[PDB]
Structure formats: C-alpha cells, structure tokens
Amino acid sequence: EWQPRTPEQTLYAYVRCLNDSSASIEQKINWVKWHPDTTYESQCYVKCVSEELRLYDPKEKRFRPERFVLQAESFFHADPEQLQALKNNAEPMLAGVLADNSCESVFNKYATFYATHHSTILRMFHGDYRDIGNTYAKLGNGVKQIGQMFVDFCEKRTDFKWNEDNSCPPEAFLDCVFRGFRWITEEGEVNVNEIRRDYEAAGKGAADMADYCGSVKGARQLYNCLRDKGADSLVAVIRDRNQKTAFYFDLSSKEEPWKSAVDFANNL
Amino acid sequence: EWQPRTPEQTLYAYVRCLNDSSASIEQKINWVKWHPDTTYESQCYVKCVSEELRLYDPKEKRFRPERFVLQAESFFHADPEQLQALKNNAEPMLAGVLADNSCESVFNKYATFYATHHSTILRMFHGDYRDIGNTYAKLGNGVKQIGQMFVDFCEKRTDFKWNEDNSCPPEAFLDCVFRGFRWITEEGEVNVNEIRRDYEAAGKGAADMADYCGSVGARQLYNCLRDKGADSLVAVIRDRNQKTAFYFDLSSKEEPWKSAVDFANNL
Amino acid sequence: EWQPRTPEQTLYAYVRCLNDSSASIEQKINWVKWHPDTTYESQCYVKCVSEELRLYDPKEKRFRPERFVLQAESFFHADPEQLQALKNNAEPMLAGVLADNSCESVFNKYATFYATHHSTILRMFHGDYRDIGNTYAKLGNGVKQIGQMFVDFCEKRTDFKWNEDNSCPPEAFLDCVFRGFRWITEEGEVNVNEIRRDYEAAGKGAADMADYCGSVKGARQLYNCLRDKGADSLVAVIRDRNQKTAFYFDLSSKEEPWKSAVDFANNL
Ligand SMILES: COC(=O)/C=C(\C)CC/C=C(\C)CC[C@H]1OC1(C)C
Ligand SMILES: COC(=O)/C=C(\C)CC/C=C(\C)CC[C@H]1OC1(C)C
Ligand SMILES: COC(=O)/C=C(\C)CC/C=C(\C)CC[C@H]1OC1(C)C
C-alpha cells in the first residue's frame, strides 16, 4: 500500500528530476520556488516528479487523488479548513483517464488542483523547512536522515552489521539497500538502468556484466545474480553509490538552483 | 534522582498500559485524545500510566507533585502564566497519602489537578506533536529515537560493539539494555514477569528456566540467565530488540492508534 | 572555506571558554543569558568565544564581518528586516585592524555591533532552543548530535568501522576524529596542548611522550607519530576523550551556570 512520501522520497524525486532536465537555470529556479510555468521543460518536470512520487500512474493514465489526501492527512496540520477543502476537491479536480501520458496532458490535468491548493501541497510534500524538525523526529530512524548513508540506515533497521565480506546478508537488508538505491523499484521490479549507471560511475561497467541481471526481474535473486558476475566489483559499486546517498544536494551550496531552493524553503 | 520523562518513557507507558487493558476500543479512543472518563477501566488506565512514569508512588501511597513541577519546567514553554499556575497548584491539589492504591482512589485524587491543567499536562508529557522535533533534538542521542532499537542505542551510549557471540559485555551496556527492556526496573529490581514474557514470546520458555533468575545488578542477572542457556538468551534479546523500534505503528489505520496520531498531530 | 557554525561548534566554544574562565558564578550566569558586562573577565570571554568560532582572527587582528552575515543567512529566519539590518551593519561596525589582540581591544570593537544586534546574534548562533529541532534536522547526520560521541559520528561519516585494534584507519576518519577532538585545529595545525591534556587526563602522561608530536607536518602523520610512542596508550586516550564528547555539559544539571543557561534558552 502506498505510504505518505517521506522527506527522503520527496528530496530524491526533486533532485533527480532536476538533474535529468536540461532546462535553463532560470526555469529550475522557478521550479524550486514551486511555480513551474507552462513551457515544455516545466511540464515534463511536473510529470517526472509526479511519476517518481507515484502520484501519477502512467499505466492507468491517471492521477491518484486519494494519495494526495493521504499525504495531507499525514503532513498538513496548519489549517483544518484548508485540509478539508483539499479532501473535497482532490477527486473532482484530478479525476479522469488521460488520452496519453505526454508532459502536456499530465501538467494540464494537474493545473486546477495545483492552483487551488498550492500552499497546502507545498507544505505536505516537505517544501516548508519550518516543519523539518517535527517531520524528521516523528519518523525518527524510520527514515534515512539528511547526511545518513543508506547502508547504515538499512543495517540499523534490520539489526545487521555488514562487514563488506564473504558473508551472505539477510534478504530484508538487501531489499532495504536495493530499494534505497532504486535498484529495485517501489513496485518490486529490477531497474537495470540504475544498476548500470552505478556500475559505470564506479568504473565497473564491463562487457561481462551483460544484461546487468535484468533477467531476474526478489532482492536475494538480484544480489546472487550480481555477485556471480564479480563479488569484489559488487562490493565496490555498493560502497561508491552508498557515499552518494548521504547528501542528495548540498543544503549550504551557493550555486543555483540549490541556493534559491534553500532560501525559499527557509523563509516562508 | 527522578528525571523528567522522555518521549520514549511516556510512549512506553501509554502503549503498554493500553495493551494491558481489556477496555473497549471506544474507551481507548477517548483515552488517546486525553479524555479519560470515570469508568473503572479508565481509572485503572490513569493509575497504570501514573505508576509507570513514577508520578504515583504505591509504596508511599501518594502522588509526587514535585515531579509534575520538574516535568513542566523541562518541557512546557508555551505559556508562562499556565506554567506558574501549575507550579503553585501541584502541591495543594496532589499531596496526601491515600488509604489504598485502588484505581478509584488514585484517579479521584488526580481529578482536580488534571481538570485544572489538562492542556499543560498533555503538552509537557509529549502529547502535542508540535513540539516533537525540539524535544527529540534537545535530548539527541541521549534518548532512544522513534524507530531505533534499544541494543543500538545502548551500544552507542557505552561505546561497545556487541557481536552477539561469546564475549562478556560491559556492565554499563547490560544495565542500559536491561533497563530499556524493563527487565531491570527504574528502582533497580529484577522484573521476572517481563523476562518470562520475552522468553515465552521468543519460543524459549522452558521449565529449566525455573524462576527466570528472580533470586538475583545487571551483571548478576546476565550471568544467571546466560548460565541457563547462552544461545537462548541471545535469541530472546534479539527478538525483544526488534520490538523496541516502534512501540506502535504511527501509520496504522487501526484504532486506537489512528486516533492517537490524528489527535496529537492537529492540536 | 569557513562554514556557518553548527550547534556542536557553538556549544563547544561556549562551554570550553566558560571552564577556562576563573570569573565568578554570578558573572558566568550573566554570560549564559547573553549579557556580558564590561569587566575584564567578560571581555576575555567574548574574545575567547569569538576566536574559537573563527569570527575574530588574531593573526590579522580583525573580526570577519562576512562570517556573521553567512551565519545569519543560514540560521536566522525570524525577521527579514532584522536579517537585512544585520547584513548592512556587519561590515561598517566590525571591519578594521585592531592595534593589539587584548581582551579590551576585541570586546570594544565588537561592542556596538553586539549591543545593536544581540537578539539576532543569539538566534543565529543557536542560543534559542525554539529552533533546535529544525537546526539539527536540516544538518542531520552531517553534525555530531547532542549525546553522540565523535568516534561514532566519524565512523558513519566515512563508512568505516573501527575495531580499536591493529588496523590502520583511513585518513578521512583520522582527520574527522582529530578535528572533533581539536587535536587538529580548523586551520590544520597540531594542537599539542590539547593532546597533552587528554593524555594526562587518561593517566597516560609520561616523559617518553616527549613533545606530544608537535613536530609533525596531516592526520596520518600525527596518528603515526602518536602510535609510535605507544599504540595501546593511544587507543586508551582516544577512548577516554571520546566518552567526553557526548555531552559537552549536562542539559539537566541544577548547578550554575548550567541551570540558568538551559532555563534562558528554553523560554525566549
Ligand atoms: C532541491 O530541489 C527542490 O527543492 C525542488 C522543488 C522544491 C521542486 C518541487 C516540485 C514541484 C514544484 C513539482 C510539482 C509538485 O507538486 C508536486 C509534488 C508534483
Ligand atoms: C499511543 O497511545 C497514546 O497516545 C495514549 C495517550 C495519549 C494516553 C495519555 C495518557 C493519559 C490521558 C493518562 C493521564 C495522563 O496524565 C498522565 C500522564 C497521568
Ligand atoms: C553552556 O554555555 C552557554 O550556554 C553559553 C552562552 C549562551 C554564552 C554565549 C556567548 C556569548 C554571550 C559571547 C559572545 C557571543 O556573540 C558571540 C557568538 C561572540
């Protein structure tokens, strides 16, 4: 069952959709201030973030209004009347199967709801840093914290110490790590493009990696398949990606769009 | 010396006292909204929670008003006038030795103070999630966090890595773990009913466990249990440890848990 | 590049400068209420805290007004007008080379800026516990938490498990630990007085320790030199100091000035 997005999940989606975009910096600054315009790159950013958070379902070609409701119930406590308004409006404003999954169709379908509940949506998806302390303390060690690496988070959650050794880790630990890396998707599928990307960035992208274990289509099975193509390489790749999971971006960066993003979120 | 209750200590008391009660879900929903009525199960819930937090002392048969004062000085910063009202009312409203420790006697003694300072008591005992970030950050790694297991917390606190093997752990680590499990009480006594509970839940309950070391310090308790089967002891610790992460599921849609979260989120 | 001071760095400076002072408890109580007076002991405390936070540079004999601005941009979100006022006043009020580094010279240079912006300064340097949750959440595991020991923090930050044995630890881990102990200063220099103090506090002071490795050039160089004077002794000192890094003072203490410090920071 779809759970309310944590700040780890929203930050992952915001940052990854930003870096996958070739849009201008001025456009990306508008996005981190929560007002994407109607240009194609902005429409595709909204579609990307919506899909990554599983708010838009491309198989059914539909927004999932009930997930916006569940997000508001968990994370919007600033205004009971605005909470009830979102509950009443979500289904009528977001209902309907779209003719296609184009960025234009998804953005246009979202537009009325987004305009009507702008400040509520911003807050419930962790856009306002006045809430950041309460949000991370309510979730505690149930969410990966800013600056915490995913392997450490998964080791604690499963009560398992991983020595980067010959031992065979428990399936619950592997599942936690691979889902944090998005090697296994939220739906449980193998994400071979992500695996290949991390192998290549670690310098382990070789021809005898073949399909990167896309054939396996279970966390144990993926781990066993990758380890059989080179155990030392697999440890190296996991370590390399792990370091990059601590800070999705630098909250103290003075480069754009990061500086504008933090300034906006800090002073609402 | 009694220290102001952490959110770990209050959440432990609230949940354990709820799960010990046979009251109806409708009653428990009222309790997690801080609205105990006067039925017997409600009176016993209030007594249970007060005793677990060491606010009511059954050996002396009295509330400890100075402990409510200390809790307010630590965790109530929202209204200076309501803080001073509580400090001046606690002793006159709560002091006095009771004729017995019955649920009715404890609840009735608490009633005027609770009615007069309801919203202050709620907030200073971590009932208002508007404060949850400041409270857990001020305590830091000094308190077990939501979702953290007690063994991890105790390993960090004592700078000890436990390999769950044949090593004999340092006493400060054992004391920390046993007190987190409430195998050793706040007063330092062995809590045999909790040890037995955890052995049975792990499938390691046996007749050779005998008295579960009631005859027995944390080193003494550890040595006594390990002498009855070292592998069983590790299995029991590991099984209870998994249960110390989330005292209840804050995402649960079952009652009373769903009402507990919605109320505390939206004051 | 100088980074905005974390609450770990401000608490370290506040506590160490207090315990270094022989001033009376009545004076120290005024200091923890952000009310230094003009006595020599108070002037010296302000200078000590300013140097420890790298806000005053004794080598160039000047305050660094731009570092106050950077601190305010990071940690003061309560009043745009007071933020802008601080930004405009920092350089005119604080810039200028002093004739000497005396307590009187540093305090007098700081005094007008402080009298003018004291409430904003308090807040941006972590003096108001209404902010404490948001601050530690936004920094996350990138800062040592209250109650956390420095070796643990440094193990997680570098993804290294230290077994306190024969192993040769990675340099990034050594640098993190030594800098947290202030054995290596923020400028990268060996702090021999701090090393000797911790050796003595652990009962490992001895004539063979000689200059306590003040001669060396690098965290690896300092570690190799200390280990060569006695490996077991070095582990014991690290373990002893590590215990003391969890709680810089007892936030539940009823002794002064600790009690008034907590009382003041809680009820602003
Ligand atoms: C570091 O990057 C960001 O902070 C990015 C931000 C704040 C972009 C937020 C995302 C949007 C404005 C896209 C639409 C938003 O309504 C959803 C959650 C689809
Ligand atoms: C998960 O369960 C809860 O949230 C339970 C709650 C909020 C019950 C709180 C306890 C009481 C209303 C009992 C009386 C309370 O005054 C004390 C701290 C004795
Ligand atoms: C535990 O000790 C404290 O709480 C100490 C405090 C609050 C002292 C704060 C420091 C000063 C008043 C010195 C000047 C301050 O302006 C700077 C940051 C130089």
Short mmCIF file of N, CA, C and O in Angstrom, two decimals, chain A residues 3-4 70 73-78 83 133-135 137-142 156-161, chain B residues 129-134 136 145-149 152 155 162 164 238 241-242 246 250-251 253 265-266:
data_model
loop_
_atom_site.label_atom_id
_atom_site.label_comp_id
_atom_site.label_asym_id
_atom_site.label_seq_id
_atom_site.Cartn_x
_atom_site.Cartn_y
_atom_site.Cartn_z
N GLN A 3 2.44 4.58 0.82
CA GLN A 3 2.55 5.32 2.06
C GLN A 3 2.86 6.79 1.77
O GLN A 3 3.47 7.10 0.74
N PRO A 4 2.46 7.69 2.67
CA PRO A 4 2.83 9.11 2.51
C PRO A 4 4.33 9.26 2.26
O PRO A 4 5.15 8.58 2.88
N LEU A 70 -4.10 11.28 1.42
CA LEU A 70 -3.34 10.60 2.46
C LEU A 70 -2.11 11.41 2.85
O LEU A 70 -1.74 11.47 4.03
N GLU A 73 -3.35 14.28 5.10
CA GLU A 73 -3.71 13.81 6.44
C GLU A 73 -2.48 13.57 7.31
O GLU A 73 -2.53 13.78 8.53
N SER A 74 -1.37 13.14 6.71
CA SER A 74 -0.17 12.85 7.48
C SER A 74 0.64 14.10 7.79
O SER A 74 1.25 14.18 8.87
N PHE A 75 0.68 15.08 6.88
CA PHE A 75 1.69 16.13 6.96
C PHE A 75 1.17 17.57 6.88
O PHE A 75 2.00 18.49 6.87
N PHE A 76 -0.13 17.80 6.80
CA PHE A 76 -0.65 19.17 6.79
C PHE A 76 -1.48 19.41 8.05
O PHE A 76 -2.61 18.92 8.15
N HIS A 77 -0.92 20.18 8.99
CA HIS A 77 -1.59 20.48 10.26
C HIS A 77 -1.80 21.97 10.49
O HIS A 77 -2.20 22.36 11.60
N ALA A 78 -1.55 22.80 9.49
CA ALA A 78 -1.59 24.25 9.67
C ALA A 78 -2.97 24.87 9.53
O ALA A 78 -3.16 26.02 9.95
N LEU A 83 -7.38 21.83 4.93
CA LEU A 83 -7.28 20.38 4.83
C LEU A 83 -8.58 19.79 4.29
O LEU A 83 -8.56 18.94 3.38
N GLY A 133 12.08 19.86 11.41
CA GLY A 133 12.40 19.21 12.67
C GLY A 133 11.32 18.24 13.12
O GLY A 133 11.61 17.09 13.47
N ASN A 134 10.07 18.70 13.12
CA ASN A 134 8.95 17.83 13.52
C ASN A 134 8.83 16.61 12.62
O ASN A 134 8.63 15.48 13.10
N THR A 135 8.96 16.81 11.31
CA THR A 135 8.80 15.73 10.35
C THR A 135 9.86 14.64 10.55
O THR A 135 9.54 13.45 10.57
N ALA A 137 11.67 14.06 13.23
CA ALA A 137 11.61 13.42 14.55
C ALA A 137 10.42 12.47 14.68
O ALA A 137 10.54 11.43 15.33
N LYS A 138 9.29 12.78 14.03
CA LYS A 138 8.15 11.87 14.03
C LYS A 138 8.48 10.58 13.30
O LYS A 138 8.03 9.50 13.69
N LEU A 139 9.25 10.68 12.22
CA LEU A 139 9.69 9.49 11.50
C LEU A 139 10.89 8.82 12.16
O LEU A 139 11.05 7.60 12.04
N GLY A 140 11.76 9.60 12.82
CA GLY A 140 12.92 9.05 13.53
C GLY A 140 13.82 8.21 12.64
O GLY A 140 14.09 8.54 11.48
N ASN A 141 14.27 7.09 13.20
CA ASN A 141 15.06 6.11 12.45
C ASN A 141 14.23 5.33 11.46
O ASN A 141 14.78 4.43 10.81
N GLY A 142 12.94 5.61 11.33
CA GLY A 142 12.20 5.02 10.23
C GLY A 142 12.45 5.64 8.87
O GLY A 142 11.94 5.13 7.86
N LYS A 156 20.90 -0.70 10.58
CA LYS A 156 20.17 -0.48 11.82
C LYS A 156 18.76 -1.06 11.75
O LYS A 156 18.30 -1.73 12.69
N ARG A 157 18.05 -0.79 10.65
CA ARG A 157 16.65 -1.20 10.53
C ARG A 157 16.49 -2.71 10.61
O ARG A 157 15.47 -3.20 11.12
N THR A 158 17.48 -3.46 10.13
CA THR A 158 17.39 -4.91 10.14
C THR A 158 18.26 -5.56 11.22
O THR A 158 18.32 -6.79 11.29
N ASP A 159 18.92 -4.77 12.07
CA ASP A 159 19.78 -5.30 13.13
C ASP A 159 20.87 -6.22 12.55
O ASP A 159 21.08 -7.34 13.01
N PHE A 160 21.55 -5.72 11.52
CA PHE A 160 22.55 -6.49 10.79
C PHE A 160 23.78 -5.63 10.59
O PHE A 160 23.68 -4.50 10.14
N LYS A 161 24.94 -6.16 10.96
CA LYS A 161 26.20 -5.49 10.67
C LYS A 161 26.82 -6.13 9.44
O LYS A 161 27.05 -7.34 9.41
N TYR B 129 2.33 16.94 19.11
CA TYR B 129 3.45 16.73 18.18
C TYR B 129 4.01 18.02 17.60
O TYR B 129 4.99 17.97 16.86
N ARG B 130 3.43 19.18 17.92
CA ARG B 130 4.05 20.43 17.51
C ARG B 130 5.44 20.61 18.11
O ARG B 130 6.27 21.35 17.55
N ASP B 131 5.72 19.92 19.21
CA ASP B 131 6.97 20.02 19.96
C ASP B 131 7.93 18.88 19.68
O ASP B 131 9.01 18.84 20.28
N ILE B 132 7.56 17.91 18.84
CA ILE B 132 8.29 16.65 18.85
C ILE B 132 9.72 16.85 18.34
O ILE B 132 10.67 16.22 18.85
N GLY B 133 9.90 17.74 17.37
CA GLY B 133 11.23 18.00 16.83
C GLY B 133 12.18 18.60 17.85
O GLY B 133 13.33 18.17 17.98
N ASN B 134 11.72 19.64 18.57
CA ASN B 134 12.56 20.27 19.59
C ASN B 134 12.87 19.29 20.71
O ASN B 134 13.99 19.26 21.23
N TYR B 136 13.03 15.87 20.72
CA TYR B 136 14.00 14.82 20.41
C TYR B 136 15.37 15.40 20.07
O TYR B 136 16.38 14.72 20.27
N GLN B 145 15.48 6.97 19.92
CA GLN B 145 14.60 7.65 18.98
C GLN B 145 13.51 6.71 18.48
O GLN B 145 13.60 5.48 18.59
N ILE B 146 12.44 7.30 17.94
CA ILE B 146 11.40 6.52 17.27
C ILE B 146 12.06 5.72 16.16
O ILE B 146 12.83 6.26 15.35
N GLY B 147 11.79 4.41 16.13
CA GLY B 147 12.38 3.53 15.13
C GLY B 147 13.77 3.01 15.44
O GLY B 147 14.28 2.18 14.68
N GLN B 148 14.41 3.46 16.50
CA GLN B 148 15.71 2.94 16.90
C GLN B 148 15.53 1.77 17.87
O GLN B 148 14.69 1.83 18.77
N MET B 149 16.32 0.71 17.69
CA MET B 149 16.26 -0.41 18.62
C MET B 149 17.13 -0.13 19.84
O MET B 149 18.11 0.62 19.77
N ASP B 152 21.07 -1.04 19.71
CA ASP B 152 21.83 0.02 19.02
C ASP B 152 22.04 1.24 19.91
O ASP B 152 23.16 1.78 19.99
N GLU B 155 24.55 0.29 22.66
CA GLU B 155 25.90 0.17 22.10
C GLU B 155 26.55 1.53 21.92
O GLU B 155 27.73 1.72 22.25
N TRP B 162 28.50 -5.01 20.18
CA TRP B 162 28.09 -6.33 20.63
C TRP B 162 27.99 -7.26 19.43
O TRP B 162 27.17 -7.05 18.53
N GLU B 164 27.03 -10.35 19.52
CA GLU B 164 26.07 -11.41 19.82
C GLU B 164 26.75 -12.78 19.90
O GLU B 164 26.16 -13.81 19.56
N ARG B 238 17.54 -10.69 20.99
CA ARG B 238 17.38 -10.25 19.60
C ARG B 238 15.91 -10.10 19.24
O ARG B 238 15.52 -9.15 18.55
N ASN B 241 14.56 -7.07 21.06
CA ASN B 241 15.17 -5.88 20.47
C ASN B 241 14.40 -5.40 19.25
O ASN B 241 14.17 -4.19 19.08
N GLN B 242 14.02 -6.33 18.37
CA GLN B 242 13.28 -5.93 17.16
C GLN B 242 12.00 -5.19 17.53
O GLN B 242 11.59 -4.26 16.82
N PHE B 246 9.58 0.37 17.17
CA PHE B 246 8.31 1.09 17.07
C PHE B 246 7.35 0.54 18.11
O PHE B 246 6.82 -0.57 17.95
N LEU B 250 2.96 4.32 13.83
CA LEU B 250 2.35 5.65 13.69
C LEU B 250 1.61 5.82 12.37
O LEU B 250 0.89 6.82 12.21
N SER B 251 1.75 4.89 11.43
CA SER B 251 0.99 4.89 10.20
C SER B 251 -0.21 3.94 10.24
O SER B 251 -0.88 3.75 9.22
N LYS B 253 -3.80 2.38 10.53
CA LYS B 253 -5.18 2.82 10.35
C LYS B 253 -6.15 2.09 11.27
O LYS B 253 -7.36 2.32 11.18
N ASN B 265 -1.27 15.15 16.16
CA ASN B 265 -0.79 15.90 15.01
C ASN B 265 -1.48 17.24 14.83
O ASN B 265 -0.93 18.11 14.14
N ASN B 266 -2.67 17.42 15.40
CA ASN B 266 -3.51 18.52 14.95
C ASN B 266 -4.03 19.35 16.12
O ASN B 266 -5.17 19.83 16.09
#
